[PDB]
Write an enzyme that holds these catalytic residues in place. Structure first.
Site, mmCIF file in Angstrom:
data_model
loop_
_atom_site.group_PDB
_atom_site.id
_atom_site.type_symbol
_atom_site.label_atom_id
_atom_site.label_comp_id
_atom_site.label_asym_id
_atom_site.label_seq_id
_atom_site.Cartn_x
_atom_site.Cartn_y
_atom_site.Cartn_z
ATOM 1 N N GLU C 128 37.824 39.564 35.451
ATOM 2 C CA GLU C 128 38.436 38.854 36.566
ATOM 3 C C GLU C 128 38.255 39.632 37.864
ATOM 4 O O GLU C 128 38.312 39.057 38.952
ATOM 5 C CB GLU C 128 39.923 38.584 36.298
ATOM 6 C CG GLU C 128 40.224 37.844 34.982
ATOM 7 C CD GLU C 128 39.463 36.522 34.802
ATOM 8 O OE1 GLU C 128 39.705 35.834 33.788
ATOM 9 O OE2 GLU C 128 38.626 36.166 35.654
ATOM 10 N N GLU C 227 33.301 33.868 30.949
ATOM 11 C CA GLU C 227 34.416 33.006 30.567
ATOM 12 C C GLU C 227 34.388 32.568 29.111
ATOM 13 O O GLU C 227 35.426 32.237 28.540
ATOM 14 C CB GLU C 227 34.478 31.779 31.479
ATOM 15 C CG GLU C 227 34.932 32.095 32.898
ATOM 16 C CD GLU C 227 36.311 32.735 32.939
ATOM 17 O OE1 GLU C 227 37.263 32.137 32.388
ATOM 18 O OE2 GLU C 227 36.442 33.832 33.527
ATOM 19 N N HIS C 230 36.730 34.755 27.387
ATOM 20 C CA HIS C 230 38.143 34.644 27.737
ATOM 21 C C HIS C 230 38.868 33.561 26.950
ATOM 22 O O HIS C 230 40.102 33.501 26.956
ATOM 23 C CB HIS C 230 38.298 34.378 29.232
ATOM 24 C CG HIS C 230 37.716 35.453 30.095
ATOM 25 N ND1 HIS C 230 37.762 35.407 31.472
ATOM 26 C CD2 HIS C 230 37.054 36.591 29.778
ATOM 27 C CE1 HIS C 230 37.150 36.469 31.964
ATOM 28 N NE2 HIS C 230 36.711 37.203 30.958
HETATM 29 FE FE FE2 Z 1 38.771 34.009 32.789
HETATM 30 FE FE FE2 Z 2 37.317 34.360 35.744
#
Ligand code: FE2
Ligand code: FE2
Ligand code: CA
Ligand code: CA
Ligand code: CA
Ligand code: FE2
Ligand code: FE2
Lengths: 388, 167, 511, 387, 511
Positions: C128, C227, C230
């Site tokens: 991030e 991502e 994530h």
């Molecule tokens: Fe993320």
């Molecule tokens: Fe992100």
């Protein structure tokens, strides 16, 4: 198909023609510098500053913020997303901090990546060159495997001490520096395990399991006070600045530097161990890189704040006194490890001098910056009491 | 002078704060300010657009005065009012755990923030309280969250329904 | 014996779970109704060094493309004007989502007790940070090489002038870090990224490419590779708390709240930026939305978690009902308040009105006619002395700000939801646009005290607000925001002052 | 201007339309693999081979060549641009060689650049961390500055020994490897000087001048036979394969490895010197890297050549013997260096153990590959006699 | 102190000159008439590690652009057919120049006695290695992602079929390494690079972009950054021998011989590749050549070396007279022998013929009419049974290969030079196209014994030569080379075999 189905405005004749026709004759503003309103720390604004400063949406009620109004959603009870209430330190502007090495994400992972690939090359050259042959067995199996290994838990705890700060830091620049200080600590813990894993491949019978190093850390005597200090720094401190400050400008600056540099870095070479110093070189490089950031935030920005300098120094002095005792205790217990070494490895004078080196560097690099009146001989005397 | 970041109201409070040169006086003004201008239970919304900023300026003064007046032990373990922080934290948590419902719990948590938010209580104890008080408050509030009809919830909250519109 | 040997990431990770040890105070510092399983595992076996390497490789290709070929092709310029403006908002707003996600995952890292779960969240903390710097770079690049640097070069401060920013901070800032760590995780990972962000990132690269922008695809496609990892974290959060009694009691409630929170903002805003902030269209928002939320997320993704007690959000039905005209209802408000932005907006052109009407029967009779009248009133011309806001005042169409979501709404004009709830409480008035946000406020009054633009700007003349918040171009006179995207006839601060527009809090009308 | 005056065919509407209209419907050949005709050394053709193999325009009269005819322009006298006459060794194909590390230019400079930047960071930390405080003064001012510095002339000479091979190599894969082997050598020599320059910056009275270390190399006793073996490998050999073979599979494998690994890498630590080993770590990483390439060329390819296996082994056995003598001599002279070490630094039992490590590793890594029957005991003795 | 300290390249290079030491046999292993002073310095103070870093950074951008954005834009495909073909020759032919330059600089490194001069040539050795792989990568990339991989994928062996390749080896292979090191230095650096290669690399990126090729610019512009470094080497080569008495006696003749050698090939070949291998033109070659050779090189560049005794090539005026029509004359031959190449050629279209006439008055009456005659006769259609080589035979226009330069020439048709010298010596015939090459052979007969294509292919049937040297595409039937650039009606080995074309040594006509 060869050309594909999706037409792109940059290359599709029909679409590009439409785009070009709608374009102005020249830019609608000649100020093509993103972040132009940021006060540069150096001669000119850096990429580091432009891409980082003011990313944090703080309102003006949090020193330095450019936004206005309360947060849109807060914690049950009312606690603000970010707020002045999460730290004792105060300042004119939380965005003043600057990592002297100007590390934003790209340069950061680039450097670590270089270190990773080179580390891998080094190990392949080390194993292929058979340099393990000249390493003292006792040093390897007892001190590297058990004691250096146990230190991984110290670094891991310091790493975790940064979790709350990653969440509470009051600005982008401080959050990024904190994130990186913490990430470098987990890396070192992982490099200690990496070495133990490497040794397990080139040395028959060497067990890479963490059971032994962990039992040493959790139940041994040599690291008892160190562990007690880490447990406190990590879980008993709820102030993100007390955490980062006490970890880097007190505990790791004294205990950490002593263990890494004055014990392992200093003695490993005497047992034909060039393996461990390779990784300690990385740890010390990381320590020195973090020191610059730690000093800029706590001394240059907070300790020298135009309006809260006196207040911040009072608070940091308080913290230094609070964590110096547990730190001396950690060092004191660690003294017990010297009795484990083969006779003639080192003596009381060498140990004392090395202790003075760490304390003197600490006084110069940290204590003196906030006018903390450290007594070097009193500190060393207290630690030497641990020599069995 | 009626700006967003700079206005007469803010200037007036800066002057008021400049005259708080005693810890007890400064700390008392800060708590009073919090009772008068913060949370949905504030005595009035007259400073709605500037209270957040003014509160921070007031905190700065109390902090500075507390650091100068307290010895190192008290700065770490006592509130600006001289109370023992641990005692206050534990006593408040005990009350929170005795809370009969979510309505009682919210008053406890909110009032705790109004009275002890740093620099009144040391941050370490304060955030430990946020941790414990917030937990119970949520546990009580999030149980059967949708059971009460809005019609009845408005009455429980005690709002004055001014206008209702529906297609 | 002396064979070239080394050690990889998985070999070290094998022992990472053992790095954590027990002690009385080893517990999360944050309030939470849930308990994360101590032996929870993570999907990827990474260590700091290997993480850095894989990310460093991506940066190489990305920046290499941006600094070399893309720059040589003048890719920063050859983009449709409307899209250059859209990216000012898209990139900077997403930037804050990336930023708060750093703090959010630092909070989850603190919450997790299993070393492996902490490590999974840790990799996201670092990702991030990368994404924050990446979104920052997009604005940085368009400011340096594009047709209009204003807004791209100072959005971090000029976004504070407008109302759309407030809602963005709710779903992508405060929603990510303020509350139970699990509630935050739902807003961020289970809902935010899975339902909107990830599908959004890809969609943006498509709309970008169609409008000539090859800068965004280069960066966002790279963000996308990260991502994919994530998702494991969000899924792992639910797994880590499923075996705890508290879960059956609170999980679906936090999820429903999280779902409504996110959807409430992105349903109208994403469709608005897509359809109104572009020349070339890729797909109607109505069909895009239903596939993302109803099918992909609210069906496939959510269904897989049924084995953990996860149910479809109870507010999903209402969300769909209010969704149809939402973005259309919002653009009227965003254009009407164009002087409060940091980007240039354009009225729909003839061709576009056909597309809108073709894809949304009834669009013309409502929105079409309105824009045609504003055009007639001279909304695009600086000497007209007209701003659409004036039209809302003349036709008695007050614009309210939802106290909870910060989403602007005009119930007397909207074709979508027209509900309005006004309450008075302890000397303050509150306006709500839906039954979910209203419950949130009634139950949690102290979580939602955000002052709205009308409250803050009440009694303030428009030009003074813009000037004070630096909403001007380098010449110190021309406004950053514009009611059209052409290169001539740009409105100045003086054109605004002459309109003598003075804000008033619409809720004060109530007795 | 904002758009610029130059129109580009990829983005210009008019030009692009013309280009698109001229394009075929699909590629005119499905074989999109450059170097597809090259025989893969591994499972699939690597980028390293595709971009390198057959770049050298050799005709079929040079084992492996794909071209035909004589060269277009030759030397005065008639000497070919490249020819079989430039080396004793023979083979069925000069393009058989393969660098096990598959290094073409890109990966090569990538790795060295990482090392350069990490090196910079290491030094900045080392100096900031005050680690110099624990280093033995005599070892620094005498063994690092004079004797370690002198050795830079050794590596430098070995570097230059590659100049002719860079011109005469008979294939691309062999030329690239040779180039890298030599470039790494000059790197090491430059790294030795960098350390001396570093010490100069953090040690007030330290002189970085190469005067002292040079005089030691040119007129000293310790490296006398070493320098004599270097001036010979470099300027007396005219056969590019003999030079590369004798330098990497004989001299540097014996003398070089003993000095770097068994002397400084083994003793520096004992004097509180982690600085020097940081650079020797590089030199060793490099040595082991080059070794795989040296082995693949002279053993895997030439030594085991399907047609000249016996022939080549004979020639390499001849060169091994030819240079094993000057190498052993260089070692002896080096032995006199221990005498200058502080009392108790090391005993004859340790050196004998180290010497055998170098000799045994040599036999296992080189000598045994070409059936060269070397006697470990006699070699160690001839060297050990230098104490 | 403990202040962060390090050491840079310059600080180490400070002592690089002292690295070399004196001893009996410390001298060059190569025959040479000059003496390079051992006190010679180099311009750039580099060490191996810094060199790698500055190059690694360039690779980063380059490869990043190629693998990412350029590939996403389908840059490998959206190139004009004629240019895709032209890059097969340009990239691969330059590749060998890059490759032999490695050996050449290796020879120069052995020649230099001063450590710094050696270090200068060394940096070039490594650069030429990078350029070899860069040119290789261009063909590799167009093979992987282009509209026609044949040729790009195997030029290293298919180039041996045609005559243009022989001349390329003379100027960029043998010319770089066979002879006095200084002579080679003049062919490589003083002339080859300074006069042709460098201006050419930039020019190629210009013609490439105009024809849709963004791949080549990405790579070639990077190569150019390195070449701005090699200029110092060629310049320093002269400074290193300017003091030696031999210089005054030899320098100018080696230079003149070097100038003629290089221009002899590039004057016709480069103009041909540019003007005939493209659709969109950048600039007329007559204009380009004059600026490069006369103005820039023969004037400014050479002029600055005057203080070192360097004089303008005596053959300069001769080169200018033979230049005007050279490239036009050669394309007729290249196209007539199209079946011997590894690329596809096209005849000028209507717009092009107009461009040629406008820029080269008289072009149409000679070249234009011939091309239209060949086309109407069906030179593009495989069912015609016609290959332009037949027209040369029918009209008694023998094609010869210069024994020295390997450049093809047809004196009976050429609009340019038409001199022809045929000699017999010890049972061998020799054909020369100019007075400078004739002297070279007469004075140095053993340096020039290269067999030409007519000698090697004498009596052989065309299709057999092609088949034997693998001049076929994947299907094993269709020729790599073609007389047009369209996707249909591609000639096959069978179409060629039916022509019953058998090579004859044209010199035997004299007996
Ligand atoms: Fe993320
Ligand atoms: Fe992100
Ligand atoms: Ca104890
Ligand atoms: Ca002693
Ligand atoms: Ca009222
Ligand atoms: Fe080159
Ligand atoms: Fe060059």
């Amino acid at each position: 198909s060869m050309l594909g189905e999706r037409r792109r405005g940059l290359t599709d004749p029909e679409m590009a023609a439409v785009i070009l026709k709608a374009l102005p004759e020249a830019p609608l503003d000649g100020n093509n510098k993103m972040g132009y309103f940021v006060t540069p720390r150096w001669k000119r604004l850096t990429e580091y500053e432009a891409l980082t400063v003011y990313a944090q949406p703080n309102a003006d009620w949090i020193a330095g913020g450019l936004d206005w109004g309360d947060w849109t959603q807060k914690f049950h009870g009312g606690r603000p997303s970010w707020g002045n209430e999460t730290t004792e330190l105060r300042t004119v502007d939380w965005f003043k901090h600057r990592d002297p090495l100007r590390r934003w994400h790209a340069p950061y992972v680039k450097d670590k990546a270089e270190e990773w690939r080179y580390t891998d090359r080094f190990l392949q050259g080390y194993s292929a060159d058979g340099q393990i042959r000249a390493m003292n067995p006792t040093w390897r199996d007892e001190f590297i495997n058990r004691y250096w290994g146990a230190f991984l838990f110290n670094e891991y705890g310091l790493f975790n001490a940064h979790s709350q700060g990653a969440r509470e830091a009051l600005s982008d620049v401080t959050r990024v520096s904190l994130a990186f200080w913490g990430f470098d600590k987990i890396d070192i813990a992982q490099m200690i395990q990496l070495e133990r894993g490497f040794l397990a491949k080139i040395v028959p019978g060497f067990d890479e399991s963490t059971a032994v190093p962990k039992a040493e850390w959790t139940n041994g005597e040599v690291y008892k006070s160190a562990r007690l200090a880490v447990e406190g720094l990590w879980q008993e401190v709820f102030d993100w600045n007390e955490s980062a400050f006490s970890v880097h400008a007190v505990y790791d600056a004294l205990f950490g530097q002593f263990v890494r540099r004055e014990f392992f870095q200093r003695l490993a070479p005497r047992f034909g161990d060039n393996l461990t110093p390779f990784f300690i070189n990385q740890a010390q490089t990381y320590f020195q890189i973090a020191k610059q950031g730690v000093q800029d935030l706590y001394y240059n920005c907070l300790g020298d704040d135009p309006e809260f300098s006196d207040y911040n120094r009072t608070v940091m002095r308080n913290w230094t006194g609070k964590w110096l005792e547990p730190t001396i205790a950690a060092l004191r217990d660690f003294m017990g490890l010297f009795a484990k070494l083969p006779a003639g490895t080192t003596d009381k004078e060498e140990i004392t001098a090395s202790l003075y080196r760490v304390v003197d560097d600490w006084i110069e690099d940290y204590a003196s910056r906030i006018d903390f009146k450290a007594d070097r001989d009193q500190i060393v005397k207290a630690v030497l009491a641990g020599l069995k | 002078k009626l700006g967003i970041h700079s206005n007469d109201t803010r200037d007036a409070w800066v002057n008021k704060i400049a005259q708080l040169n005693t810890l007890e006086k400064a700390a008392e003004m800060l708590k009073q300010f919090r009772m008068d201008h913060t949370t949905p239970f504030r005595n009035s919304y007259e400073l709605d657009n500037d209270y957040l900023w003014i509160e921070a300026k007031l905190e700065e003064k109390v902090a500075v005065l507390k650091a100068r007046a307290f010895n190192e032990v008290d700065f770490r373990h006592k509130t600006a009012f001289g109370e023992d922080a641990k005692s206050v934290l534990d006593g408040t948590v005990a009350k929170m755990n005795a809370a009969k419902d979510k309505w009682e719990a919210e008053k406890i948590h909110i009032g705790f923030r109004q009275a002890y938010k740093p620099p009144i209580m040391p941050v370490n104890y304060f955030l430990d309280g946020e941790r414990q008080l917030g937990t119970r408050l949520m546990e009580l509030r999030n149980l059967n969250y949708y059971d009460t009809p809005l019609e009845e919830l408005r009455k429980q909250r005690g709002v004055r329904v001014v206008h209702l519109q529906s297609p | 014996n002396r064979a070239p040997t080394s050690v990889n990431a998985q070999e070290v990770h094998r022992w990472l779970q053992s790095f954590n040890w027990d002690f009385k105070n080893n517990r999360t510092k944050y309030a939470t109704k849930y308990k994360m399983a101590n032996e929870t595992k993570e999907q990827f076996k990474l260590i700091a060094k290997e993480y850095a390497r894989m990310e460093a490789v991506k940066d190489e290709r990305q920046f290499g493309s941006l600094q070399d070929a893309l720059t040589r092709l003048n890719a920063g310029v050859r983009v449709h004007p409307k899209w250059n403006e859209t990216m000012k908002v898209v990139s900077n707003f997403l930037e804050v989502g990336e930023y708060n996600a750093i703090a959010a995952t630092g909070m989850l890292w603190d919450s997790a007790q299993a070393a492996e779960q902490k490590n999974g969240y840790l990799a996201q903390v670092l990702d991030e940070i990368r994404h924050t710097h990446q979104c920052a770079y997009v604005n940085y690049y368009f400011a340096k090489n594009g047709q209009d640097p204003a807004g791209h070069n100072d959005a971090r401060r000029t976004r504070t002038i407008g109302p759309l920013w407030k809602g963005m901070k709710r779903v992508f800032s405060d929603g990510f870090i303020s509350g139970d760590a699990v509630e935050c995780s739902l807003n961020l990972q289970l809902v935010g990224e899975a339902c909107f962000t990830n599908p959004l990132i890809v969609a943006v690269t498509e709309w970008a490419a169609a409008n000539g922008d090859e800068i965004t695809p280069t960066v966002f496609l790279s963000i996308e590779t990260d991502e994919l990892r994530h998702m494991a974290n969000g899924y792992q959060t639910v797994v880590s708390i499923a075996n705890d009694p508290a879960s059956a009691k609170y999980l679906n409630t936090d999820l429903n709240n999280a779902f409504w929170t996110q959807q409430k903002y992105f349903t109208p805003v994403l469709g608005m930026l897509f359809e109104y902030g572009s020349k070339f269209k890729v797909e109607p928002w109505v069909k895009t939305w239903d596939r993302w939320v109803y099918e992909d997320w609210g069906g496939i993704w959510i269904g897989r978690l049924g084995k953990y007690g996860v149910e479809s959000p109870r507010s999903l039905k209402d969300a769909k009902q209010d969704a149809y005209w939402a973005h259309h209802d919002l653009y009227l408000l965003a254009y009407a308040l164009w002087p409060t932005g940091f980007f240039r907006l354009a009225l729909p052109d003839q061709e576009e009105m056909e597309w809108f009407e073709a894809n949304y029967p009834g669009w013309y009779d409502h929105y079409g006619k309105i824009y045609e009248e504003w055009r007639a009133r001279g909304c695009e011309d600086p000497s007209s002395g007209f701003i659409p806001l004036m039209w809302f005042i003349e036709n008695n169409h007050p614009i309210y700000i939802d106290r909870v979501s910060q989403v602007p709404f005009c119930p007397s004009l909207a074709k979508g939801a027209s509900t309005l709830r006004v309450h008075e409480y302890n000397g303050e008035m509150h306006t709500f646009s839906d039954q979910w946000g209203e419950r949130m406020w009634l139950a949690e009054p102290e979580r939602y005290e955000c002052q709205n633009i009308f409250e803050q700007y009440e009694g303030r003349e428009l030009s003074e607000v813009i000037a004070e918040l630096h909403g001007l171009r380098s010449d110190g006179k021309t406004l950053i925001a514009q009611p059209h995207v052409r290169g001539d006839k740009l409105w100045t601060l003086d054109d605004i002052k002459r309109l003598n527009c003075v804000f008033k809090n619409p809720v004060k009308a109530f007795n």
